[PDB]
Amino acid sequence: ENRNAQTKQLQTAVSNVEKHFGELCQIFAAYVRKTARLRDKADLLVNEINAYAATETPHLKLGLMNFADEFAKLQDYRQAEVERLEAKVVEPLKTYGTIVKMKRDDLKATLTARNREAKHVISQAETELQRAAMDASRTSRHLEETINNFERQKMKDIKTIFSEFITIEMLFHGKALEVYTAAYQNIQNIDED
Amino acid sequence: MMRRTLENRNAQTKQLQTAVSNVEKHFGELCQIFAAYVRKTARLRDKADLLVNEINAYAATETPHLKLGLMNFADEFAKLQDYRQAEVERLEAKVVEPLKTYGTIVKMKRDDLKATLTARNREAKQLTQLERTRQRNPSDRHVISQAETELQRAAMDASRTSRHLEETINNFERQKMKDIKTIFSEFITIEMLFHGKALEVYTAAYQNIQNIDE
């Protein structure tokens, strides 16, 4: 029905996703890197608490070492958060560079194929009319289905990717809460004798 | 006994200097690592702010329902970053700065040990010089009397100093224990508060992202 409008609609949708998913990808990747750098410093904190504990009196040494044990455990969970974020948030967003490329390549091929084939006067005009009618019908069916699928998949994927980010963070914060709730007690039960 | 007071003065001096050096080394290391931890937490907060901005920028381009859901998620995530910033500031105030104060506490302890040791060095010179004088004129009634006066005074000063050292050691250690418990209790409480707020924000954000395809 409207080739200029369907074409523009598809190019605008794929280009918008390309730009914004690509930007989300690199910021998520940076967020993951910063999370790992925080985990490095927490690891140094584990090592120093144990090194100081080693020099101290029994009750204080024990309480600090027990706290270091919990805090070290938390940093294994942080490392697992780091790895799940890269696997389930960053990598799927990076995959959209390829999806967008395939969508553009299919649009170009769609219009090139119908063009290649196209390349008395009344009979010639009738054959070209018939061909144009067939191609208009097939191309507009195809463009419509490509647009509708792209948009449905983009929504599914956005929901998945942000739902995974949120799930991964909730699980880490949930573990952190229960570790810190435990660690509080053994710092508090360091007997001042 | 004088033998015991002089021995206990020397043992307490060594005990205090060893403890002061230990606290200095390890509290100073904790100080700079906690400070680095706070900095990395702020750097993560920076990256999260940029994500807020890009989620909003992408939402601005989108269809009604999807725009609404993404901007709602960005608001929640931005509020989380305000809590992270408050975590950063409280860690600095209640964990890093109390550890940093120990550089001053340690400096004051060392200055006092140095002051005591220079006084003891001056007194020891005086005492050995007086004994050299006595050996060179041992029947001098006035040197005999100076020596008797110096014996009593040094004995009294040894007792007062070891009494001083004992209270200084006991205060430093009692305070060190109180402070380390306070500092680690604050760190845990501050994090536990952030993690609880984060869990509560994400639980809301999760439920709302799921209605995005509606």
Residue numbers in the entry:
A (entry chain A): 7 to 125, 142 to 215
B (entry chain B): 1 to 214
Publication excerpt:
FAM92A1, also named CIBAR1, is a BAR domain protein that functions in important processes involving membrane remodeling, such as mitochondrial crista ultrastructure and ciliogenesis. FAM92A1 preferentially interacts with the negatively charged phospholipids PI(4,5)P2 and cardiolipin to induce extensive membrane curvature. Furthermore, FAM92A1 is predicted to feature a BAR domain at its N-terminus and an unstructured short tail at its C-terminus. By determining the crystal structure of the FAM92A1 BAR domain, combined with atomistic molecular dynamics simulations, we uncover that FAM92A1 interacts with phosphoinositide- and cardiolipin-containing membranes to induce lipid-clustering and membrane curvature.
Thus, to elucidate the structural basis for its membrane remodeling activity, we purified and crystallized the FAM92A1 N-terminal region (residues 1–219). The crystal structure of FAM92A1 BAR domain was solved at 2.03 Å resolution. Based on the crystal structure, the region spanning residues 2–211 was coiled-coil composed of three α helices, designated as the FAM92A1 BAR domain. In the asymmetric unit of the crystals, two FAM92A1 BAR domain monomers assembled via a two-fold symmetric interface, yielding a banana-shaped homo-dimer characteristic for BAR-domain proteins. The BAR domain is finalized by a last long helix (α3) covering amino acids 142–211. In the second chain α2 helix, the loop between α2 and α3 is partially disordered from Lys125 to His142, indicating some flexibility in the structure at the distal ends. The overall dimensions of the dimeric BAR domain are 150 Å in total length and ca. 25 Å in diameter around the center of the six-helical dimer bundle. The dimer interface is extensive with a total interface area of 2532 Å2 involving 65 hydrophobic residues with >70% buried surface area at the interface and 11 hydrogen-bonded interactions across the interface. Specifically, the angle between the α2 helices of the two chains in the FAM92A1 BAR domain is 33.2°, a value that is consistent with other classical BAR domains, including N-BAR domain proteins. Consistently, the membrane interacting residues identified in our previous in vitro lipid-binding assay, including Lys107, Lys109, and Arg110 and Arg132, Arg134, and Arg136, form two positive charged clusters located on the concave surface of the FAM92A1 BAR domain dimer. Furthermore, an analysis of the electrostatic potential surface of the FAM92A1 BAR domain revealed the characteristic accumulation of positive electrostatic potential/charge on the concave surface.
